[PDB]
């Protein structure tokens, strides 16, 4: 199984915080079909050969799998507002942070949180911000217990 989902849930203020990470060895696609006031997050995966994959129901989103001939369609129905991100680039090595709004990569992150904000329109230049100071972070000097001197 070269394709992996991980789910992490948590609390912020008094809300819900769901994060779904999808990864594969090859590049696959995910899109944000809107329909009518009901976002359906649809992912296309080559999948190689897979067995019967049962569908689970979760607090913030529902999952569905469709298995065609050597093709997998992942359907995500969010019960709350959801957003998509392409966290394929390794930030912890790189200094030129690219854009996270891409429709094809080897790692995708879906975020579910009730108290979100609508995307605003800013008249600006789509620069790639350069962070030149902290590239490979590490922990400094410590004692026999994990605590700074």
């Amino acid at each position: 199984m070269a394709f992996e989902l991980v789910l992490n849930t948590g609390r912020e203020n008094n809300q819900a915080f769901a994060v779904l990470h999808a990864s594969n060895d090859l590049e696959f696609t995910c899109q944000k079909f809107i329909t009518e006031a009901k976002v359906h997050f649809e992912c296309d995966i080559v999948g190689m050969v897979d067995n019967k994959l049962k569908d689970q129901s979760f607090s913030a989103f529902d999952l569905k799998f469709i298995q065609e001939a050597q093709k997998i369609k992942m359907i995500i129905l969010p019960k709350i507002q959801a957003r998509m991100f392409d966290t394929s680039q390794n930030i912890y090595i790189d200094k030129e942070l690219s854009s996270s709004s891409s429709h094809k990569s080897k790692a995708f992150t879906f975020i579910f949180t009730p108290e979100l904000a609508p995307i605003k329109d800013y008249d600006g230049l789509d620069f790639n911000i350069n962070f030149p100071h902290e590239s490979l972070p590490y922990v400094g000097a410590l004692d026999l217990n994990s605590d700074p001197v």
Binding site: Y122, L125, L136, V139, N145, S146
Partner: protein, 633 residues
């Protein structure tokens, strides 16, 4: 002194293998398992080995609960989530770290994460809340992304001093200066950085740009604000409206009246300019001009002038046809010729100054000439021209006496009175002047639009749109032939339909009319092209404009400019360059064509010619038609 301490103490000396071995020894001994695992993973990542990095990062988690009581627990968890690609978790967990030397690092990493996920404001706030790392370049880039160029310039200028961030900050500041409109500042900055010429071209090669149409053209709110409140409060609009209603000069009005079918002949023809064949030719071409056929009349006047090259009236008529056609330089030429061949034609001189003001040129000599000729005359029965002479200067008090005169009513007089009343905040008599104007001209598009905008001005957007829809629903227009006069009538009709959100239905109506039969006139095609440009349908507009140029005669400055606009909309930078060069060949000092040409040359990567066009622009100029965006792919 400890194994972990010894490893980390070697590790900041840029010695990675020995430190990694020390970390392995510390992990084997069993001292500070989690932090040793994280540092060993980062050391392994210093060299080129991804598998070992992944193995050690995965191993780091299983010892984490052992160090459950540690004031740096938040930082360790955030780092572990940071190297695994789980970024939102790391961002959510990084805000709880309040230790002394790591709070700034936590805030910097949070800024990185926010910047990745397109939350620029939070990233700016996090970077500003930091006082350990110099984040001038990142702050400037983020400010540019948000759209606050005023602080972006300061941040980038601060970052320019450091040697490492020289080239990138220079390129970013150059692009920001282009975006804001300060061109001479950009050129001065470029000239003081390098001494060679190739090096200065490489700064413009850092970021690839892409030309785009301005988003402010399609905003309904701004169009309504500028249309229903400041219709006559603009020099270009004032001059265009004066040109529309201006009269056409003849020798004898009585002879010309028998050759024109308008029912308002006495209002659009004047004989104040101090052969029978010349009279009849003038009358025929004027009839062609007034009955919604402008291009053919302009061509006929141009052809007939070559036969008789000394007649003050003919130059005025050709110049008027050019001026109503948004061809201002030839209008200047022929207006000046007309005034120089007869210095008692004051309307010709006034229109010459108007045209010379619309393009960029000095006209003080002409103003003094007409002023001297005014002060030395036996009679001055024409005071309208004297009042009009003040319009070039940005003063309006001087025409206040004109509103108290015993006057014959012609549409030029009414529109001039409306301009004068509106420009002195006398917003009450504007309505009565416009009402009289509409009463004078029943079957006119522009009069109807003006009356509607005067009557329904004091409303909101929704009421304006609903009234407009109701008003034009019951209004029937012969679309085939009525949009064939001066360009301002179409432009204003398209703008009003854009405000009311009705231009899609009108677009469908005009298409159906076009598809009913075959070859037709120019007016419908130009109106449909303009509607397509204003409906964000660029491919059809570009095809229509190419058909206009290559099928009928469309070698005009305005038509070529609009074709270039459509081509830029349809992602054709190469054709836009040729079209804009051909447009500029006549109107040399066109401030909007030059900026677009410079941007297009920068996009095609021709920096030798990009600076040439930028060198001919002022330090304060915001193009209302073109902008650029950074191409990241």
């Amino acid at each position: 002194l400890s194994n972990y301490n010894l490893g980390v103490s070697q590790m900041n000396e840029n010695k990675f293998q020995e430190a990694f071995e020390s970390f392995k020894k510390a992990i084997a001994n069993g001292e500070n398992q989690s932090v040793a695992a994280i540092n060993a993973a980062v050391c392994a990542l210093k060299l080129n080995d991804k598998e070992k990095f992944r193995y050690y990062i995965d191993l780091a988690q299983v010892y984490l609960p052992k160090e459950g009581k540690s004031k740096l627990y938040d930082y360790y968890l955030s780092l572990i989530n940071y190297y695994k690609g789980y970024y939102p978790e790391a961002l959510q967990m990084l805000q709880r770290t309040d230790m002394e030397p790591y709070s700034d690092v936590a805030k910097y990493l949070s800024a990185k994460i926010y910047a990745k996920m397109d939350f620029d404001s939070k990233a700016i706030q996090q970077l500003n809340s930091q006082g350990n790392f110099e984040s001038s370049l990142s702050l400037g880039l983020l400010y540019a992304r948000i759209g606050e160029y005023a602080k972006a310039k300061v941040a980038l200028s601060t970052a320019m001093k450091i040697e490492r961030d020289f080239n990138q900050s220079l390129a970013a500041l150059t692009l920001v200066d282009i975006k804001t409109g300060n061109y001479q500042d950009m050129l001065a900055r470029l000239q003081n950085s390098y001494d060679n010429d190739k090096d200065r071209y490489k700064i413009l090669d850092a970021y690839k740009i892409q030309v785009r149409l301005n988003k402010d053209l399609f905003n309904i709110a701004v169009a309504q604000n500028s249309f229903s409140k400041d219709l006559l409060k603009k020099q270009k609009d004032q001059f265009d409206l004066l040109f529309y209603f201006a009269p056409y000069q003849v020798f004898d009005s009585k002879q010309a009246a028998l050759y024109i079918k308008k029912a308002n002949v006495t209002d659009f023809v004047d004989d104040s300019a101090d052969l029978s064949s010349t009279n009849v030719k003038i009358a025929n071409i004027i009839n062609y001009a007034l009955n919604q056929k402008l291009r053919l009349a302009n061509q006929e006047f141009q052809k007939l002038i070559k036969d008789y090259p000394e007649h003050s009236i003919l130059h005025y008529n050709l110049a008027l046809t050019y001026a109503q056609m948004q061809n201002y330089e030839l209008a200047y030429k022929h207006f000046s010729s007309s005034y120089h061949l007869n210095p008692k034609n004051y309307l010709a001189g006034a229109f010459a100054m108007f045209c010379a003001k619309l393009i960029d040129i000095d006209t003080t000599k002409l103003y003094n000439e007409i002023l001297d000729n005014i002060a030395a005359d036996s009679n001055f029965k024409a005071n309208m021209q004297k009042s009009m002479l003040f319009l070039v200067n940005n003063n309006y008090i001087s025409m206040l006496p004109y509103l108290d005169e015993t006057k014959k009513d012609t549409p030029l007089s009414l529109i001039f009175e409306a301009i004068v009343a509106k420009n002195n905040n006398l917003n009450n008599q504007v309505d009565v002047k416009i009402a009289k104007l509409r009463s004078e001209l029943p079957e006119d598009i522009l009069a109807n639009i003006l009356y509607f905008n005067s009557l329904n001005s004091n409303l909101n957007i929704k009421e304006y749109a609903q009234n407009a829809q109701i008003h034009f629903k019951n209004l029937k227009l012969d679309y085939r032939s009525v949009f064939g006069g001066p360009n301002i009538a179409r432009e204003f009709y398209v703008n009003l339909m854009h405000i009311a959100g009705l231009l899609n239905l009108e677009r469908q109506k005009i298409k159906e009319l076009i598809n009913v039969s075959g070859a037709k006139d120019e007016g419908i095609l130009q109106t449909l092209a303009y509607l397509d440009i204003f409906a964000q349908q660029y491919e059809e507009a570009y095809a229509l404009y190419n058909s206009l140029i290559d099928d009928y005669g469309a070698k005009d400055t305005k038509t070529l400019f609009l074709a270039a606009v459509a081509a830029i909309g349809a992602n054709n930078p190469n054709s836009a360059i040729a079209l804009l060069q051909l447009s500029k060949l006549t109107d040399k000092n066109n401030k909007e064509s030059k900026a677009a040409l410079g941007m297009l040359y920068q996009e095609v990567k021709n920096y030798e010619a990009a600076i040439s066009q930028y060198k001919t622009l002022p330090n304060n100029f915001k193009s209302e038609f073109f902008t650029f965006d950074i191409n990241n792919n």
